[PDB]
Every structure is written in C-alpha cells, then in structure tokens.
C-alpha cells in the first residue's frame, strides 16, 4: 500500500495531501446516528461502534480550490475495468487535478506517488474566492510575463473533503439541486468576453492603421446604427460625450466608437488581427477547455454581428483562462504568454500578437479607469501603485455578466480576470474585487 502523492502550491503549502484521522462501525445504526472497519465521521460508544487511525485525503484550502483540485473516491467496478493495477480499497481521482494527474499521484502498491508542485498561490487563491460570497462567478489571476496561474477560482463551490471521505445524500443532493451548479469549473467554461474585449479590438485597430488614437470622432446620441438595414439593433453607450478619441472611449465604455472603428476596418482586417490570438487552439493545461471561437461560421455574414463582436458580444466564446491569456499581450509589449499550471513547466509564448506600440498605447489609456475620478474603477485608485483596468458587461439573450480586467503596470507581476454571473442580481465584478486588488498590490506588487 503506497502513499498517494501530494499536490502542493508554488511555496510547497499543501493543496491535496494526506492526514491521519481517528474515525465508524464494524436501532444500533440509529443509536450511532443520534450521537455523532468502516469509517463514518471523525471523532461511551454505542453497540457496534469503534475507532481506528485511518489516513484520509485532505484538502487544506477546502472549497476555495475544489473545482481545480477536485476530489478522490473508491475505485469503482467500472474504473478498474478500464486500465490496470487497481486495489479494491484503493483511491482514484474522480475530478480536477486529482484525476488529470492520477497516474503520477498514485504510484504502484512499491514506489510512493510523486509530488506535483503547482503555480497556485494559496494566499491569492483564498482571497480571490472570498470576494464572491456564494455569488456565481470566477476569478483567474496570473503572472502575465511567465504564465503562472496564481489562482483559478469558481463560485459557488463545494466541500471537497466531504465528497472524498464521506458526504450524506442530503448534502450531495443539495449540491446537485443548486441552480448555480457549484460543481462546474467556471474558469474553464466559455463565455462572451464583454466590453473588456474592446481593448483587443482597439489594438487590432491601431495596428491595422484605420484607428487613430488622437482622431476625434463625432458621436451624438445614446444609440447608433449604420443605416436602416440594421433594423432594431443599435450600438448603445451609457453616457453622452463628443468628440470621442481612443482613450475617452475606453474610459467611458463607448460601443458606438468601437462599432464604427470595427466597421471602418472591416471583417477582413478585424479577423486578420483576431486570428493572431489563440482562437481554436487546445492548450497544454491539464484543465479541460473548449477552444475559444470568434463566431459560429468562418465569416460573420452580418454587419450586426461584426459590430457586436467588436465589443465582446455576438458569438464570441472565450473561457476566463483563455481571456487571461489573450489579455497578457498588454503587459508583454504585444507578446502573448500561454498559461502554466505546473511550476517547473517552461514558459511558452506567441510572439507579436499585437505590436508593442499598440499594447502600450492601450495599457496606458487603461490607467484612466483607475486614476480618473470619473472612471469606473476609481474605487480602487491607489496613488502609490500603477494599475490599468477595464470593466465590462455582456448581455445574454435578459441577463448580464460582469467582467473586470486589471493589469499590474508597476512591475507587470499580476493580471486579474474576474467575472460575476447574473450581474443584475449579483452585482458587478468591480463591487467585490477591491480586497483582491489590494491584496495583490501588497503581496505580488
Ligand atoms: C459593453 O460594452 C456593455 C454592452 C455590450 O452591454 C456596455 C454596458 C455596460 S454597463 C450598462 C448597464 N449597467 C449600468 N450600471 C458597460 C460597462 O461599462 O460595463 N459597457
């Protein structure tokens, strides 16, 4: 009987480890149930009860990292009849990294399982989970220049220690009957990026030459369409301002400005620049994801969809992890940095996804979201720290999702991608994210 390997964080702190507990049994079942060898619960005894020192799989961060780490279980009859070397009372990973790394972690019952060290920072993981407070959402924090996944959070969550060691049918049905679905790994689920995506459309415009950062576009009204052929669809903005240049459009969230710049460049110039990103790519992460997509077809076949895609709507599906990877070009002078989860994995990059001038131009104008008093992220303003940010929402056809992207511009050591589902009921991502941004500005700097 070999010991299961440990999953540890970037500092060696435990994420999936082993711990000895003093657990059970070997009218009497009701007498045992009305007071607290087959273990039951962790510890003058009823008839049939006993205690023993059993080693159990333990997760220190608990629900804070449940979807990422996953849980283990007994080797089912269907599990052993699928591979080789399986004990009747063995332990196999059922989900998360406990499954994806199960081969390395279980060993052979005799060499012990190997220890896998991750990029996760436990302190960041716990902070990033604590801001949600049962709200449905996700948070992806990364080292933008190296790809390190410092945290991958999905909310709501579940207790991984009970699912692995002993959970009642009532607690499991409560987890399954949750409309928010705590078992899903929202950081790996594809969503529309929302207004935050305008950063990338802006960069693509700067490089294509059709978008001038100092050009003063005349925009009047709260809604705009190319002509009558658009029907009832309009590009809408929340505040009236004119004339609008690149910096003011990014601070005021002006879809009319970016719809016009997207129609100005055209589907070909827009797709030329989008294709340099990781659309369609399966990544090397041990997390299962559907590749990001631009639209359902190879061509928009619709000026409405072309403009809609310009500000993160339309048929865009990008997961939070893939969104973090795409947005890393602003902290690497246009170079994209793939995400890594294992700490000793080499950093993988994709050179010149956008130009260095376009990356820095966008990144500089995004300081206004935090530093200008009228900006939407002014609540997190800090005179001693350079932070660029960009809020955004995405309407799903009568619900909205809230997105917040922040970039460390003092040392380019962190990047955050936060999402709150059903933001009309659960609030924006900007309203809950300040403790996370403050925590990261002090730790990661
Ligand atoms: C993105 O650009 C969205 C649009 C695609 O729906 C707009 C709308 C929003 S917020 C308007 C409703 N909430 C008001 N408090 C913005 C944004 O700044 O998040 N961009």
Q: What is the DSSP string of 324-377?
A: HHHHGGGGTTT-EE--B-BTTSPP-EE--SS-HHHHHHHHHHTTHHHHSTTSTT
Closest C-alpha to ligand 1, atom 10: 393
Bridge-based pairing of strands 387-396 and 399-408 is antiparallel
- For a substitution probing ligand 1, which of 191, 192, 391, 392 has the most ligand atoms within 8 Å of its CB? 392
Q: What is the DSSP string of 7-59?
A: EE-TTS-EEEEEEEEE--B--HHHHHHTT--B--S-----TTB---EEEEEE-
Closest CA relative to residue 395, chosen from 311, 339, 295, 288? 311
| 275 within some domain | yes
Chosen domain end from 64, 99, 118: 118
Helix ranges (H only) for 275-319 are 303-310
Residue 413 and residue 285 share a domain:
yes
**Overall domain count for the chain:** 2
- How many CB atoms lie under 10 A from the CB of residue 31? 13
Q: In angstroms, what CA-CA distances link 412 with 119, 152, 284, 363, 376?
A: 17, 19, 23, 11, 22
DSSP 176: H
Please list the residues that pair with 151 across neighbouring strands: 141
- Which residues neighbour 229 within 8 Å (Cβ) at sequence distance 6 or greater? 303
Question: Rounded to an integer, what distance in angstroms lies between the CA atom of residue 418 and that of residue 320?
Answer: 8
117 CB burial (10 A radius; 0-12, 13-18, 19+): middle
Q: What is the CATH number of the domain that holds 84?
A: 3.90.1310.10
- Which residues neighbour 69 within 8 Å (Cβ) at sequence distance 6 or greater? 7, 15, 16, 59, 61, 96, 97, 98, 160
CA 247 to ligand 1 centroid distance, Å: 17
Method: X-ray
Residue 272 and residue 359 share a domain:
yes
Closest CA relative to residue 10, chosen from 153, 201, 143? 143
Residue 180, both tokens: 């928010």
- How many CB atoms lie under 10 A from the CB of residue 309? 26
| 423 within some domain | yes
Chain centre to alpha carbon of residue 42: 34
Place of tokens 């801001």: 131
CA 239 to ligand 1 centroid distance, Å: 10
| 44 within some domain | no
Chain centre to alpha carbon of residue 163: 23
Question: Rounded to an integer, what distance in angstroms lies between the CA atom of residue 323 and that of residue 197?
Answer: 9
- Which residues neighbour 351 within 8 Å (Cβ) at sequence distance 6 or greater? 335
Residue 200 and residue 60 share a domain:
no
Closest C-alpha to ligand 1, atom 14: 238
- 416 conformational bin, left if phi > 0, alpha if psi -120 to 50, beta if neither: beta
Residue 311 alpha carbon, nearest atom of ligand 1: 2
Closest CA relative to residue 405, chosen from 140, 149, 206, 156? 140
Question: Rounded to an integer, what distance in angstroms lies between the CA atom of residue 57 and that of residue 99?
Answer: 14
The helix or strand, by DSSP H or E, that contains position 104, with its residue range, turns out to be helix 102-106
Residue 238 alpha carbon, nearest atom of ligand 1: 11
Question: Rounded to an integer, what distance in angstroms lies between the CA atom of residue 405 and that of residue 421?
Answer: 15
Question: Rounded to an integer, what distance in angstroms lies between the CA atom of residue 47 and that of residue 28?
Answer: 6
Chosen domain end from 94, 118, 142: 118
| Share of the chain residues as helix, strand and coil, in percent rounded to the nearest 5 | 35, 20, 45
Closest C-alpha to ligand 1, atom 9: 393
Number of H helices, E strands in the chain: 18, 15
Question: Rounded to an integer, what distance in angstroms lies between the CA atom of residue 51 and that of residue 41?
Answer: 10
| 169 within some domain | no
Residue 255 alpha carbon, nearest atom of ligand 1: 2
Q: What is the DSSP string of 371-402?
A: HSTTSTTGGG--TTS-EEEEEEEEEE--EEEE
Bridge-based pairing of strands 116-117 and 7-8 is parallel
CA 34 to ligand 1 centroid distance, Å: 54
| 36 within some domain | no
Closest CA relative to residue 147, chosen from 314, 391, 349, 334? 349
CA 195 to ligand 1 centroid distance, Å: 7
Q: In angstroms, what CA-CA distances link 77 with 101, 173, 264?
A: 21, 23, 61
Question: Rounded to an integer, what distance in angstroms lies between the CA atom of residue 91 and that of residue 112?
Answer: 13
Place of tokens 């969503």: 191
Closest C-alpha to ligand 1, atom 8: 393
Q: In angstroms, what CA-CA distances link 132 with 153, 203, 210?
A: 10, 31, 40
| 3 within some domain | yes
- Strand locations in 44-108, DSSP E? 53-58, 72-74, 91-93
Residue 202 and residue 103 share a domain:
no
Residue 370, both tokens: 């935090």
Question: Rounded to an integer, what distance in angstroms lies between the CA atom of residue 251 and that of residue 326?
Answer: 20
- 395 conformational bin, left if phi > 0, alpha if psi -120 to 50, beta if neither: beta
The helix or strand, by DSSP H or E, that contains position 274, with its residue range, turns out to be helix 255-274
Question: Rounded to an integer, what distance in angstroms lies between the CA atom of residue 445 and that of residue 428?
Answer: 25
Question: Rounded to an integer, what distance in angstroms lies between the CA atom of residue 76 and that of residue 74?
Answer: 6
Is 319 within 8 Å of 185 (Cβ atoms)? Answer: no
- For a substitution probing ligand 1, which of 194, 239, 378 has the most ligand atoms within 8 Å of its CB? 194
Residue 10, both tokens: 């970037």
Residue 253 and residue 108 share a domain:
no
Chosen domain end from 118, 149, 172: 118
DSSP 60: T
Question: Rounded to an integer, what distance in angstroms lies between the CA atom of residue 23 and that of residue 250?
Answer: 58
| 157 within some domain | no
Question: Rounded to an integer, what distance in angstroms lies between the CA atom of residue 114 and that of residue 127?
Answer: 28
Is 340 within 8 Å of 347 (Cβ atoms)? Answer: yes
Residue 428 and residue 343 share a domain:
yes
Is 440 within 8 Å of 407 (Cβ atoms)? Answer: no
Resolution attained, angstroms = 2.6
Residue 221 and residue 90 share a domain:
no
13 CB burial (10 A radius; 0-12, 13-18, 19+): middle
Place of tokens 């310009």: 310
Place of tokens 């995004």: 366
Residue 260, both tokens: 């016009």
Is 69 within 8 Å of 98 (Cβ atoms)? Answer: yes
The sign one gets for the Cα dihedral 20, 26, 28, 30 is positive
Question: Rounded to an integer, what distance in angstroms lies between the CA atom of residue 197 and that of residue 189?
Answer: 17
Q: What is the CATH number of the domain that holds 407?
A: 3.40.710.10
Question: Rounded to an integer, what distance in angstroms lies between the CA atom of residue 165 and that of residue 171?
Answer: 13
Question: Rounded to an integer, what distance in angstroms lies between the CA atom of residue 91 and that of residue 70?
Answer: 13
**3-class secondary structure, 263:** helix
Question: Rounded to an integer, what distance in angstroms lies between the CA atom of residue 10 and that of residue 125?
Answer: 12
Residue numbers of the domain that contains 299: 195-442
Residue 228 and residue 372 share a domain:
yes
CA 423 to ligand 1 centroid distance, Å: 11
Please list the residues that pair with 149 across neighbouring strands: 142
Closest C-alpha to ligand 1, atom 19: 392
Place of tokens 């996700």: 138
Q: Which residues line ligand 1 (CB under 6 A)?
A: 194-195, 238, 253, 255, 311, 313, 376, 391-393, 395
CA 424 to ligand 1 centroid distance, Å: 11
Catalytic residues: 195
Closest CA relative to residue 308, chosen from 335, 334, 270, 340? 270
Please list the residues that pair with 53 across neighbouring strands: 22
Q: Length of the chain in residues, anyone?
A: 445
Residue 405, both tokens: 């992207």
């Amino acid at each position: 009987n070999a010991k299961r390997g440990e999953i540890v964080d970037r500092n060696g702190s435990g994420l999936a480890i082993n711990k000895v507990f003093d657990e059970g049994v070997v009218a009497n079942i009701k007498a045992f149930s009305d007071k607290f060898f087959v273990p039951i619960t962790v510890a003058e005894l009823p008839t049939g009860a006993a205690t023993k020192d059993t080693e159990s799989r333990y997760y220190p961060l608990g629900e804070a990292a449940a979807q990422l780490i996953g849980y283990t279980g007994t080797i089912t009859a269907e599990d052993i009849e699928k591979n080789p070397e399986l004990s009747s009372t063995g332990v196999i990973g059922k989900t998360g990294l406990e499954r994806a790394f199960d081969k390395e972690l279980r060993g052979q019952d005799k060499k012990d399982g190997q220890t896998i060290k991750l990029t996760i920072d436990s302190g960041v993981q716990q902070q990033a989970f604590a801001i949600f407070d049962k709200r449905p959402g996700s948070a992806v924090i990364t080292d933008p220049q190296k790809g390190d996944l410092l945290a991958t959070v999905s909310s709501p969550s579940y207790d991984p220690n009970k699912m692995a060691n002993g959970i009642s049918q009532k607690e499991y049905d409560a987890y399954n009957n949750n409309k928010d679905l705590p078992f899903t790994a929202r950081f790996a689920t594809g969503y529309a990026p929302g207004s935050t995506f305008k950063t990338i459309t802006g960069a693509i415009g700067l490089d294509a030459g059709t978008l001038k950062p100092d050009e003063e576009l005349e925009i009047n009204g709260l809604k705009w369409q190319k002509d009558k052929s658009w029907g009832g669809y309009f590009a809408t903005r929340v505040k009236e301002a004119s004339p609008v240049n690149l910096r003011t459009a990014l601070v005021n969230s002006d879809n009319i400005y970016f719809a016009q710049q997207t129609l100005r460049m055209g589907e070909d110039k827009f797709r030329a620049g989008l294709n340099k990103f990781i659309f369609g790519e399966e990544l090397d992460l041990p997390i299962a994801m559907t590749p990001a997509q631009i639209s359902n077809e190879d061509k928009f076949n619709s000026e409405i969809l072309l403009a809609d895609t310009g500000y993160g709507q339309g048929q865009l599906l990008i997961s939070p992890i893939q969104q973090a990877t795409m947005y890393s070009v602003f902290q690497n002078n246009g170079t994209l940095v793939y995400p890594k989860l294992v700490l000793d994995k080499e950093t993988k990059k994709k050179d010149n996804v956008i130009s260095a001038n376009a990356a820095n131009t966008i990144a500089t104008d995004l300081l206004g979201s935090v530093e200008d008093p009228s900006g939407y992220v002014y609540n997190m303003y800090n005179p001693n720290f350079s932070l660029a940010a960009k809020t955004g929402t995405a309407e799903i056809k009568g619900k909205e999702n809230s997105f917040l992207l922040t970039l460390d511009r003092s040392n380019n050591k962190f990047l955050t991608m936060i999402m709150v589902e059903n933001s009309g009921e659960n609030g924006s991502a900007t309203d809950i994210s300040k403790p996370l941004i403050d925590y990261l500005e002090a730790t990661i700097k």
